[PDB]
Design a protein around this ligand. Structure first.
Ligand SMILES: CCCCCCCCCCCCCCCCCC(=O)OC[C@H](COP(=O)([O-])OCC(O)COP(=O)([O-])OC[C@@H](COC(=O)CCCCCCCCCCCCCCCCC)OC(=O)CCCCCCCCCCCCCCCCC)OC(=O)CCCCCCCCCCCCCCCCC
Ligand SMILES: CCCCCCCCCCCCCCCCCC(=O)OC[C@H](COP(=O)([O-])OCC(O)COP(=O)([O-])OC[C@@H](COC(=O)CCCCCCCCCCCCCCCCC)OC(=O)CCCCCCCCCCCCCCCCC)OC(=O)CCCCCCCCCCCCCCCCC
Ligand SMILES: CCCCCCCCCCCCCCCCCC(=O)OC[C@H](COP(=O)([O-])OCC(O)COP(=O)([O-])OC[C@@H](COC(=O)CCCCCCCCCCCCCCCCC)OC(=O)CCCCCCCCCCCCCCCCC)OC(=O)CCCCCCCCCCCCCCCCC
Ligand code: BCL
Ligand code: BCL
Ligand SMILES: CC[C@H]1c2cc3[nH]c4c(c3C)C(=O)[C@H](C(=O)OC)c4c3nc(cc4[nH]c(cc(n2)[C@@H]1C)c(C(C)=O)c4C)[C@@H](C)[C@@H]3CCC(=O)OC/C=C(\C)CCC[C@@H](C)CCC[C@@H](C)CCCC(C)C
Ligand SMILES: COC1=C(OC)C(=O)C(C/C=C(/C)CC/C=C(\C)CC/C=C(\C)CC/C=C(\C)CC/C=C(\C)CC/C=C(\C)CC/C=C(/C)CC/C=C(\C)CC/C=C(\C)CCC=C(C)C)=C(C)C1=O
Ligand SMILES: CC(C)C/C=C/[C@@H](C)C/C=C/[C@@H](C)CCC[C@@H](C)CCCC[C@H](C)CCC[C@@H](C)CCC[C@@H](C)CCCC(C)(C)O
Ligand SMILES: CCCCCCCCCCCCO[C@@H]1O[C@H](CO)[C@@H](O[C@H]2O[C@H](CO)[C@@H](O)[C@H](O)[C@H]2O)[C@H](O)[C@H]1O
Ligand SMILES: [Fe+3]
Lengths: 45, 47, 247, 276, 306, 46, 46, 46, 46, 46, 49, 49, 50, 49, 46
């Protein structure tokens, strides 16, 4: 599996991975915040 | 690639680590105070 | 995403488009940096590491040419980084002053690039920029003025020479240059058509970039029937210098 | 801070006002005196919008709005809290646009190129001035300008449009829409053509302008050329804005505010060739 | 410096150009070719030759079938009078089917002719797309033009085919007429709330405005540096001259960033293609997903409850 | 079967495959969240 | 772990980190300020 | 304070000063006309 | 603190500072003139 | 901690710091002015 | 030399003049603020003036 | 040399002056905040002020 | 050098003579037309109407 | 020639003709204004209509 | 023998002077036309 780095530049791969991860995290957070059961700030209603 | 010597990289890493850790400590104290002001994470029926 | 919930399909689609558009902007700004990088640091800055900006310049790109050769961009050999200029002040962002003659040094608005010293070859390996006397089958559409014979005047009313030929572009039929014989020299120079007003005074050609007595200094061509890209760029820059230094 | 080829161009001279005092760069940006002036105008306008928003009910980006004065003030000066902020923001915006154009003129002079870009920006400045100055004056009051809001000036556009029957029957409006759509078509064509000539099929050399002429002579039977396409692009993009400005000038000042554009076209239906 | 490059001063005339020889697998071109003096004042003077093969001829035949259907219905709606036809030509149309027939094939005088004309026009447009792709491939060039055309085709299909499908009725489509289709546009906006509050409509308008802005900017820039040989955009990329250097430095000193001789055409391509794409998405969402755009805008804080 | 990689360069194919799989997974998750029976956050009664 | 600084320029990394952190903090503050419970300026009224 | 003309060039300072003063006078007059008490053309509003 | 003039040209720094100060003064005067209590021309709204 | 100036140019970091601080102060002052409790010019009802 | 292009002597001279001018500016501003407070005080109470 | 282009002596000098100015700024801001709290307190209870 | 327009002095004077004669005839005919139009219905009413 | 393309004597001739034509334009305009004032005087009495 | 036309070029001063003067005249005439008391075209708006 260590050969993937012979296929992709580690710098570009790492930057793209971090950007993808942050985007996914913030999107999941906002989806949870949009609901009513899992809204942790003002609560359910 | 970056253009940094190995010693420069190690020194930068040490200073970066200590700065990050102090920032984390300050943030944790801020969060303790913020929870003391108003807790989040309500119950399923509200606050 | 259920009916009645706050989340719905339209706003999900909108956020998908926002993410795609951020990606596209990054791709476009990445493509924008294939010429002129890395940057040249100003005065009072460190020169140990390169400045490239946050969208990093992409890897060099290779184009396949007609004969079988290749061309790798960025073209680092076209930059001319060492010219006759001196800084007008020690702080960053200060303009430069020409140390010598800006018409002959190629600085400022009279600056040219170090292009390849060969003519553009066209689709049959024959030069495309050609005098009308060497392009069999082309003429000048008699409905328009015939510049051959008209005198040429500078920005100061002085006559600098006369028009003897019109250099045309084959495969893109257009008049690109006029051949000018200087007043008292029997020598020939080129004048770009976009720099000249044919028939501004009824029987003359007006060039308001350089003074009439400066046509003697226009760079010349090696051969009398073809021009290279470097010579074209130099001839254009010479007239461009007069826009700021003719006084 | 300079591109790899930029140093030989950063020479002194070519200003209009101020001499060599403002003849420097800040990063990539040239400054001049008009750069200072335009940043000043922009910052005053932004601060005024922010102050007008603090006096309002919300900070929502989509609902911010700076409303023009009431019609009871005519063409005079309104109190700052009841319409004057709109007038001062309009003044600041006009100043910023004019100074931007003049800075572009200075850059053109320093580089030694033609003045086509500031001339083309003057058309957009003219359309803005027609919308906020000329038409409100010909109508009688500043209350006819549009609000400075992301979604409130769209409501202004729709109300103004429905104030004349159906705005689609405005003939200058039709010509302007035709020019806009043609501009989009030509931009797509030109971009795609240059890209396909520079990035050819797999295993091919880079093409030439003869291939570019040939492909459109094979498609539609005519090709305009490399200088012709740029001339035509400028022409179309400027004609669209000219005819939109004309479209708005004749609506209200010429055709009354309660009239209908569909009924103008009846001049064609009443020609004596077929009218009775 | 005083000569603006708007009009050609002196025109050069030579023999007609036959064209680059075609890759094997294509018919021969035509030979009729002429020159026009006025077209040469702004651009090129040669007119022709044209290439017609199978796809172009079939495209023209189907398009003329559709045009003939539309015109014969317009003449029948006016009792075949040519005087009354010319009197009101922009007010005539071939109406879409009636709402009571769903997606079936309606009677001829209630939607059948409209459906047949739409079918033949769609086949014509698809054949022209194939022709663009084929003519581009026959010279070894890329296919960017046909993939830009595909976006306009997609907006056309969304307006006429996809949205009626998802709504389950042919009556949701525009008529074939000059003023009637403008009336259809107005009524479509009125029927589904206010189309100003459709965010993809807003994005499409932004991209149309940016297309005009960018094409004005590019035309003005290329005309300004044409004295240094700037209009040869292909040779200026393989061998950078001073014209493109000045062009890039103008916009760098103006607004902080610039492009290359090639990437600006990518900006152009993308801003032109993104208008009909966002438009098609917004049209597909209108009706099937959202039926009142002002209520959507109020729900998401675009406007006060009003 | 390894001959497929004599036609497609592995890097481009792999990038395209990852984009395709991610988009498909996103679409399936959102379709499931759209319904009433398989909504796993708020539950039934849509 | 120190080897990550042989890959990326530390200047651009620090500028990116600072911009990212400031944007995140400003967004979190604005999100809290637009709620009723966690609005510390005018209070829990609205 | 004669030393100011060692740092600046009077021929340009005068132009800048005159333009600034003209703009400031314009601003003040425009602001005065905006009011009811200090409007010297129509006087107080109804 | 005099070392700040080894990094910045005093002429252009001074003119930029004056421009900044003038803009700030104008903004504060507008803000005060736009209120009701601190309007020094017409007075309170009432 | 003085080593931060072996990485960044002090002269431009100082200008960037000035700009950032002024922008932040302006934002905070407008936020305060927009509220009811902390409006120090006209007072509560707003 | 220096990035500015000045020597220590010129820098100290300009700094002295700059401090003097800044201080006169601050003094005039303080007087203006005292006068403005005597005209109308700000910072009301939680219930108003 | 160094990435910035400075030496250690210049770095330390600039850092001394920077730290001094930053600390004066911080002190002034702390006093401003104490006065602002004396004028209005913030952080209300869950039921208002 | 020569003329900025291309016409010599003789051609210029001839064109000017013909131009002046034509302009004068135009003005005379216009004056007669205006006298007749005034005789038909005058303009410039009093401040209260006709 | 020169920047414009004219000599000094040519410029003086141009200026003489320009001045005399502009003067005739101004005098006929003044006559027109006198007539117009006699028809409908602007600047009327305290409240004119 | 006034040196003012020795350090300051007249042909460039005159055009800018005339621009400013013409603009000011236009501004004043507009301001007067847009009022009820000093509108000389018709008069008051009744
Ligand atoms: C709701 C509102 C929405 C709209 C908001 C609009 C906001 C407009 C902001 C305009 C100002 C932006 C300035 C950015 C400068 C960044 C740095 C720089 O020079 O980059 C060069 C760089 C290009 O060169 P590069 O090779 O990529 O990078 C070189 C390096 O930067 C290294 O280059 P260098 O070595 O030359 O050093 C550069 C450095 C020089 O060194 C310095 O330290 C200079 C001293 C100043 C430092 C700090 C400068 C300012 C930092 C950012 C401040 C941002 C806020 C400004 C105020 C905003 C007020 C509202 O900095 C500068 O030159 C700064 C110049 C300006 C001062 O990037 C650009 O030029 C970017 C241009 C962006 C233009 C504005 C685009 C705004 C968005 C448009 C669309 C908006 C849509 C909104 C839709 C809303 C809903 C409908
Ligand atoms: C429930 C279903 C779920 C499905 C799974 C999930 C969704 C999957 C979606 C997949 C979409 C397509 C993916 C593959 C695209 C390949 C494009 C390509 O190779 O372009 C090469 C092209 C470069 O080509 P080149 O180097 O100029 O020329 C190469 C050869 O010399 C010249 O070579 P050539 O002449 O053979 O080609 C010329 C070139 C010309 O360039 C293009 O065509 C590229 C632009 C494509 C536009 C497509 C328009 C489609 C219009 C509607 C569809 C057609 C309707 C009508 C059909 C005909 C009717 C008669 O065209 C192509 O290479 C592509 C042909 C196919 C286009 C349509 C693909 C769909 O790439 C670009 O220019 C850049 C592309 C854009 C990149 C932007 C940055 C990333 C954007 C994404 C950021 C993150 C988004 C996150 C979203 C939210 C997540 C939650
Ligand atoms: C949920 C939220 C999630 C997050 C959201 C946000 C996420 C982040 C987004 C980021 C987007 C990209 C931005 C760039 C990030 C990466 C930068 C990078 O890699 O290097 C910098 C990079 C240049 O790299 P380089 O040329 O290699 O130079 C490397 C060195 O920096 C050259 O070094 P140098 O020495 O030559 O020059 C130095 C100079 C460089 O200056 C600059 O580069 C100026 C520009 C900076 C970047 C500005 C970015 C602005 C981003 C705006 C984002 C959008 C805002 C939208 C707002 C909407 C409002 C409605 O200054 C500094 O770097 C100073 C740093 C050190 C400061 C030290 C302070 C004191 C520390 C010590 C304290 C005391 C300790 C001791 C205590 C005592 C102990 C005893 O910057 C650029 O490329 C600039 C252009 C980038 C695009 C700009 C336009 C983007 C679109 C903007 C739209 C909005 C309008 C404009 C903004 C409006 C704002 C209100
Ligand atoms: C119900 C409403 C009516 C209608 C009512 C109106 C009204 C009212 C108007 C139009 C106008 C237009 N309509 Mg209409 N219109 C309708 C339907 C349409 C349809 C359609 C498909 O149905 C189309 C294509 C159009 C198209 C058009 C254009 C002809 C025109 C908009 C272009 C323009 O004004 O450029 C002008 C461009 C500008 C003014 C841009 C100004 C640029 C400035 C100088 C720069 C600003 C910079 C900024 C401040 C700073 C940014 C810096 C940042 C850092 C980036 N309308 C409907 C039927 N329409 C407008 C028009 O013609 O005005 C001239 C107009 O007022
Ligand atoms: C009152 C009316 C509504 C309104 C109702 C609509 C409706 C409905 C639509 C738009 C659409 C658009 N509107 Mg709108 N729009 C309004 C106000 C505006 C204003 C304005 C200033 O007020 C502007 C600038 C616009 C502009 C726009 C564009 C962004 C967009 C059109 C894209 C396009 O290029 O299609 C033109 C291109 C095509 C239609 C594709 C061309 C198809 C093929 C390529 C052509 C084949 C021709 C064939 C061969 C010829 C022979 C055929 C036979 C002769 C028959 N609208 C108001 C609010 N608008 C469209 C959109 O996509 O938005 C979501 C759309 O459907
Ligand atoms: C990027 C989106 C924009 C766009 C792009 C675009 N349009 C395109 C293309 C592209 C990239 C093409 O390649 C294609 C084309 O051929 O352009 C020259 C085309 C085209 N866009 C056209 C029209 C068009 N585009 C429009 C819009 C837009 N096109 C968008 C704004 C509109 C509008 C606003 O309503 C119209 C009316 C055509 C000129 C052409 C597609 C021609 C076609 O499909 O023909 C079908 C044939 C018939 C209907 C038969 C009847 C004959 C004619 C009535 C049709 C036109 C024929 C003529 C163009 C060529 C004839 C040559 C002869 C020698 C045979
Ligand atoms: C009573 O009513 C009628 C009208 O009066 C109201 C009319 O006025 C007319 C019209 C006639 C006139 C009076 C005008 C004069 C015109 C003519 C004289 C021409 C006569 C025309 C006809 C009689 C019929 C014309 C039909 C044609 C030209 C072909 C039709 C083909 C199809 C409809 C395709 C079938 C549908 C399919 C397959 C759907 C697939 C989807 C697509 C859109 C893609 C289609 C693509 C292809 C099939 C081709 C692909 C080709 C490729 C890839 C290229 C391959 C490589 C090659 C080079 C070959 C008629 C006929 C009519 O009755
Ligand atoms: C059962 C399935 C299988 C079939 C369906 C297959 C689907 C795929 C069909 C889908 C059709 C959709 C997609 C198309 C929808 C169309 C809209 C998008 C756009 C409407 C067009 C708007 C124009 C303004 C029309 C004007 C035309 C008219 C003015 C010209 C008339 C010509 C006359 C004068 C002919 C000259 C006079 C004489 C008598 C000689 O001829
Ligand atoms: C480039 C073009 C390629 C083809 C693109 C389009 C392909 C077709 C898309 C997939 C079809 C989806 O399937 C389609 O679903 C819609 C939406 O419920 C149904 O449409 C439905 O609409 C509503 C309910 O929503 C009812 O009033 C209607 O009677 C019913 O038909 C269609 O009857 C069915 O055909
Ligand atoms: Fe181009």
């Amino acid at each position: 599996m260590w050969r993937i780095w012979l296929l992709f530049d580690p710098r570009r791969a790492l930057v793209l991975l971090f950007v993808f991860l942050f985007g996914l995290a913030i999107i999941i957070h906002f989806i949870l915040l949009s609901t009513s059961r899992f809204n942790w700030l003002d609560g359910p209603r | 690639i970056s253009g940094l010597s190995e010693a420069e990289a190690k020194e930068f890493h040490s200073i970066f680590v200590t700065s990050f850790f102090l920032f984390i400590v300050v943030a944790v104290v801020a969060h303790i105070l913020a929870w003391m002001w108003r807790p989040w994470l309500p119950k399923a029926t509200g606050y | 995403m259920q009916p009645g919930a706050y989340l719905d399909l339209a706003q999900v689609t909108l956020y998908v488009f926002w993410i795609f558009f951020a990606g596209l902007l990054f791709y476009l700004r990445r493509e924008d940096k294939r010429e002129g990088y890395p940057l040249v640091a100003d005065a009072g800055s460190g020169t140990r590491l390169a400045k490239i900006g946050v969208p990093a310049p992409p890897d060099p790109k290779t184009y396949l040419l007609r004969g079988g050769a290749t061309k790798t961009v960025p073209s680092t050999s076209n930059d001319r980084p060492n010219v006759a200029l001196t800084p007008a002040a020690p702080w960053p962002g200060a303009p430069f002053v020409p140390t010598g003659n800006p018409f002959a040094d190629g600085v400022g608005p009279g600056s040219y690039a170090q292009r390849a010293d060969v003519p553009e070859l066209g689709l049959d390996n024959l030069p495309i920029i050609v005098p009308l006397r060497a392009a069999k089958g082309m003429f000048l559409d008699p409905r328009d003025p015939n510049p051959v014979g008209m005198p040429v005047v500078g920005c100061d009313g002085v006559v600098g020479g006369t028009v003897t030929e019109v250099w045309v572009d084959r495969a893109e039929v257009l008049a690109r240059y006029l051949e000018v014989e200087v007043a008292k020299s029997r020598k020939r120079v080129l004048l770009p058509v976009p720099f000249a007003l044919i028939n501004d005074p009824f029987g003359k050609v007006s060039v308001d970039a350089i003074r009439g007595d400066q046509f003697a200094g226009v760079p010349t061509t090696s051969k009398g029937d073809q021009v290279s890209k470097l010579e074209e760029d130099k001839i254009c820059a010479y007239y461009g210098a007069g826009t700021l230094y003719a006084t | 801070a300079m591109l790899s080829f930029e140093k030989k161009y950063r020479v002194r001279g070519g200003t209009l006002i101020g001499g060599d005092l403002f003849d420097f760069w800040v990063g990539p940006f040239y400054v001049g005196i008009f750069g200072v002036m335009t940043v000043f105008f922009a910052l005053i306008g932004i601060a005024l919008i922010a102050w007008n928003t603090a006096l309002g009910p919300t900070w929502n980006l989509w609902q911010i709005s700076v409303n023009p004065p009431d019609a009871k003030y005519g063409l005079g000066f309104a109190p700052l809290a009841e319409g004057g902020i709109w007038q001062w923001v309009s003044i600041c915006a006009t100043g910023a646009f004019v100074t931007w154009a003049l800075r572009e003129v200075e850059i053109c002079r320093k580089l030694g190129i033609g003045f086509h870009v500031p001339f083309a920006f003057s058309f957009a400045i003219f359309a803005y001035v027609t919308l906020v100055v000329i038409r409100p004056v010909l109508m009688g009051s500043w209350s006819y300008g549009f609000p400075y809001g992301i979604f409130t000036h769209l409501d202004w556009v729709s109300n103004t449009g429905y104030s004349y029957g159906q705005f689609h029957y405005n003939p200058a409006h039709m010509i302007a829409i035709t020019f806009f759509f043609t501009t989009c078509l030509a931009l797509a064509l030109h971009g795609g053509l240059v890209l396909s000539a520079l990035n050819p099929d797999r295993g091919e050399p880079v093409k030439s302008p003869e291939h570019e002429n040939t492909v459109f002579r094979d498609l539609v039977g005519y090709s305009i050329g490399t200088i012709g396409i740029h001339r035509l692009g400028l022409f179309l993009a400027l004609s669209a804005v000219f005819f939109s400005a004309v479209c708005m000038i004749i609506s209200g000042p010429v055709l009354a505010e309660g009239g209908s554009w569909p009924d103008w076209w009846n001049w064609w239906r009443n020609l004596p060739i077929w009218n009775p | 410096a005083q000569y603006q490059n708007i009009f050609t001063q002196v025109q050069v005339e030579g023999p007609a150009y036959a064209g680059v020889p075609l890759r094997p697998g294509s018919s021969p071109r035509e030979t009729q070719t002429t020159f026009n003096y006025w077209l040469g004042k702004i651009g090129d003077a040669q007119v022709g030759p044209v290439y017609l093969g199978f796809t172009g001829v079939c495209s023209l035949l189907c398009g003329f079938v559709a045009i003939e259907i539309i015109g014969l219905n317009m003449l029948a709606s006016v009792d075949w009078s040519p005087i009354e036809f010319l009197r009101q030509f922009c007010w005539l149309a071939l109406e879409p089917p009636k709402p009571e027939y769903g997606l079936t094939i309606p009677p001829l005088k209630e939607g059948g002719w409209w459906l047949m004309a739409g079918f033949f026009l769609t086949v014509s447009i698809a054949l022209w797309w194939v022709r663009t792709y084929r003519r581009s491939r026959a010279l070894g060039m890329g296919t960017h033009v046909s993939w830009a055309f595909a976006s306009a085709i997609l907006l056309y299909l969304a307006l006429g085919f996809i949205q009626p499908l998802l709504m389950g009725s042919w009556s949701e489509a525009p008529p074939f007429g000059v003023f009637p289709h403008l009336d259809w546009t107005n009524n479509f906006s009125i029927k589904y709330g206010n189309l100003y509050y459709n965010p993809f409509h807003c994005l499409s308008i932004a991209f149309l405005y940016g297309s005009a802005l960018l094409f004005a900017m590019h035309g003005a820039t290329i005309l300004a540096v044409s004295r240094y040989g700037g209009e040869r955009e292909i040779e200026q990329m393989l061998d950078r001259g001073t014209a493109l250097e000045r062009a890039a430095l103008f916009w760098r000193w103006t607004m902080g960033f610039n492009a290359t001789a090639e990437s600006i055409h990518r900006w152009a391509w993308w801003f032109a293609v993104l208008c009909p794409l966002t438009g098609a998405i917004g049209i597909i969402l209108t009706g099937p997903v959202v039926d009142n755009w002002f209520d959507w805008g109020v729900k998401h804080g675009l406007a006060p409850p009003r």
